[PDB]
């Protein structure tokens, strides 16, 4: 598996989660942020949240692969979308 395709798949997975959120309506800090959001999503399970929480798990793993190679539900997901869009452009600056 090529590392560039891992990066292409990371950027793509982020866009997918951002799109999932609106349809309802360096790597260490990104990982630390996702971990906090996962804990939040685990306290508010729903059909969409459970799917998003699974994607968040895949995104954290993709972040670790890169390092070693070299309604309250609406409000919570709205903040997460902001954080996700932040990572999406920061990954380009590599």
């Amino acid at each position: 598996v090529p590392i560039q395709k891992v990066q292409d798949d990371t950027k793509t997975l982020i866009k997918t989660i951002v799109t999932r959120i609106n349809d309802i309506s360096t790597l260490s800090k990104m990982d630390q942020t996702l971990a906090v959001y996962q804990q939040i999503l685990t306290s508010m399970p729903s059909r969409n949240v459970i799917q998003i929480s699974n994607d968040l798990e895949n995104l954290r793993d993709l972040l670790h692969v890169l390092a070693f190679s070299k309604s309250t539900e609406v409000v919570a997901l709205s903040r997460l979308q902001g954080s996700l869009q932040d990572m999406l452009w920061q990954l380009d600056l590599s």
């Binding site: 598996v1 798949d9 793509t12 997975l13 866009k15 997918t16 799109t19 999932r20 349809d23 459970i50 799917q51 699974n54 994607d55 798990e57 895949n58 793993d61 993709l62 692969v65």
Partner: protein
């Protein structure tokens, strides 16, 4: 005869449906069958293999004789290694394992909002459409057009393209237009042809 397992992730990326035949299986009717799978943390292995730690999957026999198993929710980038455990009269008989990545087996939705307009002054038909919400990857489009009542097809590879303009032999005639899309990298299925748009 080995058992072929084919999977397809829906256009909304919520589930993956897998199917396996029983036609090249009727020879050994006396035997219990069960689909087994092993989920990888990320991506598929270069060579799939039977793993000691596996989980069974609930498959349901359909009218066409195929078993349908639904994985929901889905881990889009986790490697699903599957096989059929056969117990004909004693012991274990595992079919050849195949690994599938749900993100690379997505069948996208047909592109919404298809419009076909003939502008006389230009002499072309501006076929326009809207990309389906999922997948987020780059897409290639295929357009089929012909006399409403003879079909030449055109391919568009620019991912950032919403519309195109093609020539016709008769600007007065009524033409039926359909569009379909697939992942530009080839890792995916073609969507169904959109509802026909008329000039």
């Amino acid at each position: 005869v080995n058992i072929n397992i084919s999977c397809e992730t829906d256009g909304y990326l919520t589930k993956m449906t897998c199917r396996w035949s029983t036609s090249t299986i009727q020879s050994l009717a006396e035997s219990t069958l069960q689909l087994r799978y092993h989920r990888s943390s990320l991506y598929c292995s270069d060579i799939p293999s039977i793993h000691p730690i596996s989980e069974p999957k609930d498959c349901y026999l359909q009218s066409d004789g195929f078993y349908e198993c639904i994985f929901q929710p889905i881990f889009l980038l986790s490697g699903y290694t599957m096989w059929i455990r056969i117990q004909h009269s004693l012991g274990s008989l595992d079919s050849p394992p195949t690994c599938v990545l749900p993100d690379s087996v997505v069948k996208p939705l047909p592109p919404s909002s298809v419009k076909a307009e003939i502008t006389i002054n230009i002499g072309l038909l501006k076929i326009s459409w809207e990309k389906p919400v999922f997948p987020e990857n780059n897409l290639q489009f295929q357009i089929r057009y012909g006399l409403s009542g003879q079909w030449k097809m055109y391919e568009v590879y620019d991912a950032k393209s919403k519309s195109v303009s093609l020539p016709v032999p008769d600007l007065s005639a009524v033409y039926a237009v359909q569009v379909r899309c697939k992942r530009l990298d080839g890792l995916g299925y073609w969507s169904n042809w959109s509802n026909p748009a008329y000039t």
